[PDB]
Amino acid sequence: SSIPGPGYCMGIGPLISHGRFLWMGIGSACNYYNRVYGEFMRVWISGEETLIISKSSSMFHIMKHNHYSSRFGSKLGLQCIGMHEKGIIFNNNPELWKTTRPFFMKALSGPGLVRMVTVCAESLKTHLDRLEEVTNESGYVDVLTLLRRVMLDTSNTLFLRIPLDESAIVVKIQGYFDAWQALLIKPDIFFKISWLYKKYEKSVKDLKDAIEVLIAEKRRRISTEEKLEECMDFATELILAEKRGDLTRENVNQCILEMLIAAPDTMSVSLFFMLFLIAKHPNVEEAIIKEIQTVIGERDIKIDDIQKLKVMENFIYESMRYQPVVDLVMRKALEDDVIDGYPVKKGTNIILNIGRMHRLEFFPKPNEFTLENFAKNVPYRYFQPFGFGPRGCAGKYIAMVMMKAILVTLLRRFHVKTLQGQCVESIQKIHDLSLHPDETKNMLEMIFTPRN
Ligand code: HEM
Ligand SMILES: C[C@]12CCC(=O)C=C1CC[C@@H]1[C@@H]2CC[C@]2(C)C(=O)CC[C@@H]12
């Protein structure tokens, strides 16, 4: 059927689109091009032809099949952040990825998913008893920081459990995410002029070194153990795999790093948007509070509760649909294939614009926030907040458990208020690697007034 998109200008076509991605940010540029040209179109990042697609049918084909189980990005950028053929997130070596993923899949389901519900609640409780760490003179809570701090504490106590400087690591993680987002699609030219990136190089060293201290301690505790099998975790599994010849030390270290940053990166921003939505939708917030009374009372949250929290589940789904954070997914074609009548050569980059997809396709009221969008069972071939298939979000199930547990134990205790007019729509956003608040602006704080 041939491929819609801007003209190749004897080598200038590519330069404009790349430059546009650099100026605009990956997210907004994807939205720009899907709006101007079709919902399935072609662009260039560096040399490579890269398709940006919002069509749900294309989405489904791509995530369903093994020959798309890869992402893309600057080799120089990925090596720089330590994700070139090393973690899982942007590990683009198919075999190395294939054998690393199982470790993440195991730690993020089964017994660990069950522990996580209570670990989360206890972590948030402990931090809500310490609001003095995060509250203003005028009573303003820095929710973003609060959330990141518990999200890290959660991840640590589950996957690594080694005592750490919470506040410091949180800042370093933000530093890391920046470098990652900055360098991911910079052209090779950029990496020549060195005073243009050593800024980021230092953020990566900051976190990596901080995590080595932690892994080093974890190695010692493991080497002298009252028999291991009585307390396995994600970090130990990796280290034992490395003592068999299955894993590389560097690779082990990147995995632990990726496991620690994941929730602080995505969950906190997600829950923040969720909290602002609750503040602005009193009717929805009452439904949730009533559901909590009916299902939980004043008991501690337990695993058997989470299925029963139907209203909240819908809230989480709608929040994510309406105000996403991870609104785009990056892939690469590993074999040739024809998809929706379009020829897709192997080596072709893909960006699935799931945020735009969720506004064009299935839902009754796409462009407004309502639980009405989830009054009837949503097919999942029209709603992919996490992705599905051989490379879908590794933490897709545990994420819903964590989001429920923290939302429950927060709202259970506090009413949340927004400052001035502020709502998710009025928040100034950066739309690049993910969709998140521009933190150089202000009025991002909240007021946590008690209940009863
Ligand atoms: C609301 C929070 C989250 C959202 C919206 C989210 C969404 C996503 C999406 C859309 C992907 C891409 C899937 C694909 O390529 O088809 C992804 C990948 C991934 N996510 Fe999540 N995720 C969340 C939370 C988490 C958590 C809590 C963890 C673990 C602690 C996690 C770990 C990962 C990993 C390791 C990958 C890379 C998978 C791979 O390439 O093999 N995510 N996430
Ligand atoms: C969910 C995620 C991993 C855990 C983490 O630490 C932070 C993020 C945000 C960026 C996500 C990424 C997963 C892969 C994604 C979906 C892409 O293919 C483009 C954007 C990117």
XYZ file of C-alpha atoms and ligand atoms in Angstrom:
516
model
C 0.000 0.000 0.000
C 3.103 2.266 0.315
C 3.867 4.513 3.258
C 2.485 7.984 4.266
C 4.884 10.647 5.643
C 6.999 13.747 4.844
C 9.020 13.818 1.640
C 12.551 12.513 1.494
C 14.340 15.686 0.430
C 17.431 14.116 -1.091
C 18.748 13.821 2.485
C 16.930 16.769 4.083
C 13.717 14.844 4.807
C 15.540 12.798 7.517
C 17.263 15.879 8.991
C 14.019 17.774 9.632
C 12.171 14.894 11.347
C 15.119 13.966 13.569
C 15.632 17.646 14.482
C 11.907 17.915 15.162
C 12.136 14.925 17.528
C 15.080 16.609 19.266
C 13.326 19.967 19.630
C 9.848 18.676 20.421
C 10.554 15.501 22.389
C 9.715 11.960 21.300
C 6.146 12.034 22.656
C 4.898 15.321 21.240
C 6.603 14.721 17.873
C 4.809 11.360 17.571
C 1.561 13.167 18.271
C 2.425 15.858 15.746
C 3.151 13.411 12.925
C 0.143 11.155 13.583
C -2.039 14.262 13.418
C -0.514 15.816 10.262
C -0.008 12.539 8.331
C -1.908 9.265 9.018
C -2.255 7.059 12.109
C 0.403 4.895 10.453
C 3.305 6.817 8.954
C 7.069 7.031 8.340
C 9.830 9.224 9.729
C 13.625 9.121 10.194
C 15.608 9.028 13.406
C 19.274 9.059 12.436
C 19.596 7.043 9.241
C 16.906 4.483 10.107
C 13.356 4.635 8.820
C 11.112 4.616 11.858
C 7.357 4.065 11.745
C 5.134 5.843 14.192
C 1.822 4.004 14.539
C -1.333 4.607 16.572
C -3.555 2.027 14.807
C -4.758 -0.532 17.372
C -4.580 -3.334 14.775
C -0.917 -2.553 14.093
C -0.311 -2.225 17.822
C -1.765 -5.689 18.416
C 0.138 -7.380 15.595
C 3.476 -5.974 16.767
C 3.219 -6.853 20.473
C 1.753 -10.300 19.711
C 4.716 -11.521 17.607
C 8.263 -12.537 18.601
C 9.824 -10.760 15.610
C 9.178 -7.393 17.292
C 10.665 -8.324 20.689
C 13.312 -5.582 20.361
C 13.540 -1.820 20.945
C 15.884 0.739 19.397
C 18.044 3.763 20.231
C 21.497 5.297 19.880
C 24.186 2.686 20.549
C 26.423 5.456 21.955
C 23.598 6.687 24.200
C 22.734 3.217 25.479
C 26.368 2.293 26.184
C 26.677 5.544 28.016
C 23.755 4.819 30.378
C 24.758 1.132 30.597
C 21.683 -0.272 28.818
C 23.369 -1.382 25.582
C 22.877 -5.150 25.503
C 22.823 -5.241 29.289
C 19.565 -4.799 31.130
C 16.235 -5.725 29.790
C 14.459 -2.395 29.218
C 16.549 -1.333 26.194
C 18.467 -4.578 25.783
C 18.243 -5.041 22.032
C 20.314 -8.235 21.781
C 17.472 -10.810 21.318
C 19.249 -13.784 22.908
C 20.777 -11.908 25.818
C 17.384 -10.286 26.429
C 15.591 -13.649 26.142
C 17.760 -15.107 28.925
C 17.638 -12.058 31.238
C 13.891 -11.476 31.136
C 12.976 -14.675 33.092
C 14.645 -13.194 36.201
C 12.387 -10.152 36.074
C 9.271 -12.217 35.327
C 9.844 -14.463 38.346
C 10.496 -11.644 40.851
C 7.410 -9.678 39.681
C 4.782 -12.430 40.121
C 4.022 -15.458 42.326
C 4.994 -15.076 46.013
C 6.761 -11.708 45.484
C 3.577 -10.171 44.067
C 1.804 -11.370 47.236
C 4.497 -9.917 49.569
C 4.361 -6.661 47.622
C 0.844 -5.721 48.745
C 1.855 -5.633 52.388
C 5.382 -4.286 51.711
C 3.820 -1.329 49.865
C 1.308 -0.532 52.596
C 3.935 -0.702 55.376
C 6.296 1.506 53.334
C 3.651 4.161 52.711
C 2.490 4.005 56.353
C 6.020 4.596 57.575
C 6.398 7.593 55.252
C 2.982 9.055 56.090
C 4.096 8.998 59.751
C 6.963 11.215 58.656
C 5.240 13.911 56.574
C 7.637 16.426 58.169
C 10.137 15.251 55.508
C 8.064 16.428 52.629
C 5.682 19.100 54.004
C 5.973 22.922 53.656
C 5.534 25.590 56.343
C 2.186 26.378 54.672
C 1.324 22.643 54.719
C 2.354 21.848 51.121
C 3.380 18.224 50.542
C 5.926 17.420 47.836
C 3.978 14.400 46.593
C 6.331 13.551 43.729
C 9.213 13.162 46.221
C 7.114 11.323 48.779
C 5.947 8.844 46.123
C 9.429 8.278 44.676
C 10.818 7.681 48.142
C 8.321 4.959 49.053
C 8.482 3.458 45.553
C 12.238 3.012 46.051
C 11.813 1.720 49.603
C 9.246 -0.762 48.292
C 11.467 -2.007 45.440
C 14.483 -2.301 47.746
C 12.753 -4.241 50.517
C 11.328 -6.633 47.900
C 14.127 -7.197 45.348
C 17.439 -6.352 47.030
C 16.806 -5.482 50.690
C 20.050 -3.706 51.627
C 19.868 -0.503 53.794
C 20.268 2.637 51.655
C 20.199 6.431 51.723
C 16.652 6.842 50.452
C 16.753 10.608 49.765
C 20.071 10.533 47.924
C 19.303 7.520 45.674
C 15.985 9.117 44.668
C 17.813 12.200 43.373
C 20.377 10.028 41.596
C 17.589 7.997 39.947
C 16.086 11.263 38.616
C 19.591 12.092 37.383
C 19.806 8.739 35.619
C 16.383 9.058 34.008
C 17.442 12.392 32.580
C 20.600 11.035 31.011
C 18.593 8.141 29.595
C 15.926 10.417 28.155
C 18.526 12.920 26.923
C 20.859 10.509 25.129
C 18.402 7.925 23.756
C 18.020 9.408 20.255
C 20.898 11.900 20.028
C 22.771 11.480 16.697
C 26.355 10.234 16.706
C 27.592 13.767 15.895
C 26.439 14.804 19.414
C 28.817 12.343 21.076
C 31.936 13.897 19.494
C 31.765 17.226 21.352
C 32.355 15.981 24.880
C 31.436 18.993 27.055
C 27.972 18.398 25.567
C 27.334 15.142 27.490
C 29.793 14.633 30.404
C 26.975 16.253 32.381
C 24.959 13.039 31.877
C 27.947 10.717 32.129
C 28.353 11.976 35.715
C 24.704 11.264 36.645
C 25.139 7.664 35.437
C 28.342 7.231 37.454
C 26.536 8.810 40.435
C 23.809 6.149 40.534
C 25.903 3.212 39.303
C 28.530 3.799 42.030
C 25.813 4.222 44.643
C 24.337 0.879 43.578
C 27.731 -0.902 43.551
C 28.098 -0.089 47.262
C 24.755 -1.862 47.699
C 25.521 -4.872 45.441
C 28.916 -5.256 47.178
C 27.174 -5.612 50.546
C 24.608 -7.996 49.044
C 27.449 -10.215 47.775
C 28.990 -10.454 51.268
C 25.716 -11.334 53.004
C 25.124 -14.035 50.391
C 28.627 -15.552 50.695
C 27.989 -16.112 54.428
C 24.436 -17.406 54.723
C 22.404 -19.485 57.194
C 21.483 -21.449 54.040
C 20.211 -19.323 51.116
C 17.067 -21.058 49.800
C 15.218 -19.816 52.903
C 15.340 -16.182 51.668
C 15.673 -15.865 47.892
C 15.107 -12.555 46.129
C 15.679 -10.987 42.709
C 19.248 -9.868 43.493
C 20.272 -13.234 44.947
C 18.790 -15.122 41.969
C 20.970 -13.054 39.640
C 24.107 -13.449 41.759
C 23.650 -17.235 41.913
C 23.060 -17.303 38.152
C 26.371 -15.428 37.886
C 28.183 -17.963 40.075
C 26.998 -20.629 37.750
C 28.337 -19.238 34.462
C 24.911 -17.985 33.285
C 25.279 -14.223 33.745
C 27.919 -11.526 33.484
C 28.735 -9.371 36.528
C 28.140 -6.103 34.565
C 24.818 -7.511 33.398
C 23.802 -8.530 36.948
C 24.596 -5.007 38.109
C 22.528 -3.378 35.373
C 19.571 -5.651 36.185
C 19.543 -4.661 39.842
C 19.781 -0.997 38.778
C 16.879 -1.334 36.318
C 14.763 -3.125 38.928
C 15.310 -0.295 41.424
C 14.575 2.652 39.113
C 11.488 1.158 37.448
C 8.784 1.980 40.007
C 10.279 5.339 41.130
C 10.341 6.281 37.441
C 6.830 5.323 36.375
C 4.659 4.500 39.404
C 5.230 7.727 41.284
C 4.404 9.961 38.307
C 1.393 7.687 37.575
C 0.119 7.868 41.135
C 0.754 11.606 41.202
C -1.527 12.119 38.175
C -3.973 9.739 39.830
C -3.925 11.832 43.027
C -4.620 15.097 41.165
C -7.520 13.427 39.412
C -8.979 12.305 42.743
C -8.670 15.856 44.071
C -10.682 17.149 41.094
C -13.332 14.417 40.942
C -15.198 14.292 44.312
C -17.908 11.914 43.053
C -15.260 9.409 41.902
C -13.394 9.842 45.206
C -16.538 8.998 47.203
C -17.195 5.849 45.183
C -13.653 4.754 46.106
C -14.012 5.591 49.816
C -17.310 3.672 50.010
C -15.690 0.699 48.261
C -12.857 0.763 50.818
C -15.306 0.744 53.761
C -17.349 -2.126 52.289
C -14.321 -4.251 51.384
C -11.653 -3.437 53.990
C -13.008 -1.540 57.045
C -10.032 -0.780 59.321
C -8.229 -4.044 58.599
C -4.774 -4.046 56.981
C -4.910 -4.406 53.183
C -4.402 -8.036 52.134
C -3.979 -9.825 48.772
C -7.580 -11.166 48.703
C -8.837 -7.575 48.850
C -7.354 -6.456 45.534
C -9.773 -8.248 43.168
C -12.695 -6.790 45.129
C -11.520 -3.193 44.642
C -13.380 -2.920 41.330
C -14.083 0.835 41.372
C -10.462 1.712 42.118
C -9.247 -0.686 39.449
C -11.412 1.211 36.969
C -10.102 4.495 38.309
C -6.509 3.331 37.774
C -7.347 2.113 34.245
C -9.126 5.357 33.333
C -6.408 7.551 34.847
C -3.811 5.683 32.797
C -5.978 5.818 29.675
C -6.811 9.541 29.958
C -3.590 10.871 31.537
C -0.855 8.370 30.590
C 2.793 8.515 31.598
C 4.011 5.745 29.319
C 2.118 6.902 26.246
C 4.564 5.405 23.724
C 6.359 2.098 23.186
C 9.552 1.717 21.146
C 10.095 -1.415 19.041
C 12.139 -2.745 16.092
C 11.237 -5.230 13.356
C 13.447 -8.339 13.460
C 11.962 -10.099 10.425
C 10.226 -8.797 7.297
C 6.430 -8.771 7.494
C 3.402 -7.047 6.018
C 1.279 -5.366 8.672
C -2.115 -3.761 7.892
C -1.223 -3.923 4.183
C 2.015 -1.985 4.782
C 5.452 -3.526 4.035
C 7.683 -3.565 7.143
C 11.337 -4.412 6.486
C 13.456 -5.941 9.246
C 15.580 -3.281 10.953
C 12.655 -0.811 10.792
C 12.083 1.141 13.999
C 8.584 1.425 15.483
C 6.957 3.803 17.917
C 3.537 2.709 19.101
C 1.669 5.821 20.167
C -0.611 4.122 22.678
C -1.681 7.408 24.292
C -3.220 8.641 21.026
C -4.587 5.164 20.279
C -6.520 5.311 23.573
C -8.304 8.436 22.329
C -9.176 7.331 18.809
C -10.378 3.783 18.993
C -12.676 1.953 21.404
C -13.857 4.130 24.247
C -17.311 5.774 24.434
C -16.013 9.106 25.770
C -12.356 9.235 24.686
C -11.520 12.906 25.300
C -12.849 13.212 28.849
C -12.076 11.539 32.181
C -14.966 9.172 33.155
C -15.255 5.728 34.683
C -18.001 5.395 32.033
C -15.166 4.444 29.669
C -14.849 1.250 31.740
C -18.518 0.495 32.520
C -18.267 -2.470 30.128
C -15.382 -4.991 29.887
C -12.543 -3.546 27.786
C -11.209 -6.091 25.211
C -7.448 -5.456 25.891
C -6.899 -5.506 22.154
C -8.146 -1.915 22.385
C -6.498 -0.989 25.687
C -2.796 -1.533 26.278
C -1.568 0.590 29.205
C 1.237 -1.909 29.922
C 1.699 -3.700 26.618
C 1.146 -7.471 26.323
C 3.008 -10.345 24.631
C 6.607 -11.645 24.841
C 7.976 -8.139 25.594
C 5.069 -6.458 27.444
C 5.626 -4.622 30.735
C 7.419 -7.114 32.979
C 5.743 -5.533 35.981
C 2.239 -5.259 34.543
C 0.538 -7.385 37.202
C 2.512 -6.248 40.258
C 2.047 -2.614 39.155
C -1.715 -2.867 39.617
C -1.247 -4.443 43.029
C 1.135 -1.686 44.133
C -1.023 1.133 42.809
C -4.048 -0.262 44.596
C -2.229 -0.747 47.889
C -0.756 2.741 48.012
C -3.987 4.448 46.835
C -5.934 2.512 49.442
C -3.644 3.263 52.360
C -3.273 6.948 51.406
C -6.951 7.855 50.773
C -7.941 5.699 53.758
C -6.110 8.307 55.856
C -6.142 11.633 53.977
C -8.288 13.805 51.768
C -6.077 15.261 49.031
C -6.344 18.841 47.817
C -4.758 20.575 44.843
C -3.282 24.139 45.012
C -5.256 26.937 43.289
C -6.977 25.887 40.071
C -4.402 23.163 39.373
C -5.461 19.891 37.740
C -3.806 17.346 35.416
C -4.917 19.370 32.376
C -3.364 22.617 33.641
C -0.071 20.976 34.735
C 2.760 21.934 32.433
C 4.164 18.722 30.964
C 7.339 17.414 29.349
C 6.398 15.063 26.522
C 9.597 13.272 25.584
C 10.551 9.685 26.630
C 7.584 9.633 28.991
C 4.820 12.104 29.786
C 5.573 13.801 33.119
C 5.357 17.145 34.998
C 8.003 19.772 34.230
C 9.474 20.096 37.694
C 11.158 23.440 37.011
C 7.632 24.890 37.197
C 5.813 24.935 40.534
C 2.342 24.531 42.108
C 2.861 20.741 41.938
C 2.353 20.328 45.683
C -0.745 19.016 47.446
C -2.491 19.420 50.807
C -3.106 16.250 52.843
C -5.968 16.983 55.218
C -6.965 14.066 57.594
C -10.144 11.944 57.639
C -12.666 11.915 60.548
C 1.971 2.314 36.054
C 3.243 1.919 36.011
C 3.816 1.245 34.747
C 3.494 1.451 33.465
C 2.432 2.418 32.895
C 4.329 0.581 32.671
C 4.298 0.462 31.317
C 5.216 -0.225 30.578
C 5.166 -0.367 29.141
C 4.059 0.206 28.223
C 6.241 -1.067 28.779
C 6.592 -1.476 27.335
C 5.969 -2.842 27.057
C 6.116 -3.204 25.598
O 7.210 -2.937 25.018
O 5.148 -3.763 25.008
C 7.002 -1.388 29.982
C 8.178 -2.103 30.031
C 8.840 -2.556 31.149
N 8.408 -2.375 32.458
Fe 6.654 -1.382 33.012
N 5.142 -0.142 33.501
C 4.852 0.239 34.787
C 5.429 -0.246 35.932
C 6.497 -1.093 36.003
C 7.056 -1.647 37.224
C 6.505 -1.384 38.643
C 8.110 -2.408 36.881
C 9.049 -3.240 37.788
C 9.416 -2.816 39.005
C 8.229 -2.344 35.440
C 9.185 -2.983 34.716
C 9.294 -2.957 33.353
C 10.384 -3.561 32.633
C 11.581 -4.299 33.257
C 10.093 -3.298 31.158
C 10.965 -3.752 29.968
C 10.332 -5.017 29.401
C 11.138 -5.599 28.261
O 11.561 -4.821 27.357
O 11.346 -6.847 28.246
N 7.232 -1.541 34.931
N 6.341 -0.859 31.064
C 8.373 1.951 31.598
C 9.844 2.308 31.388
C 10.730 1.231 32.039
C 10.880 1.389 33.547
C 11.359 2.800 33.817
O 12.268 2.978 34.628
C 10.788 3.843 33.158
C 10.121 3.687 31.992
C 9.643 4.935 31.279
C 10.036 4.871 29.807
C 9.539 3.576 29.176
C 10.165 2.355 29.880
C 9.849 1.020 29.179
C 10.081 1.031 27.668
C 9.334 2.203 27.057
C 7.815 2.032 27.176
C 9.630 2.512 25.617
O 9.817 1.657 24.765
C 9.658 4.004 25.346
C 9.423 4.606 26.739
C 9.855 3.486 27.691
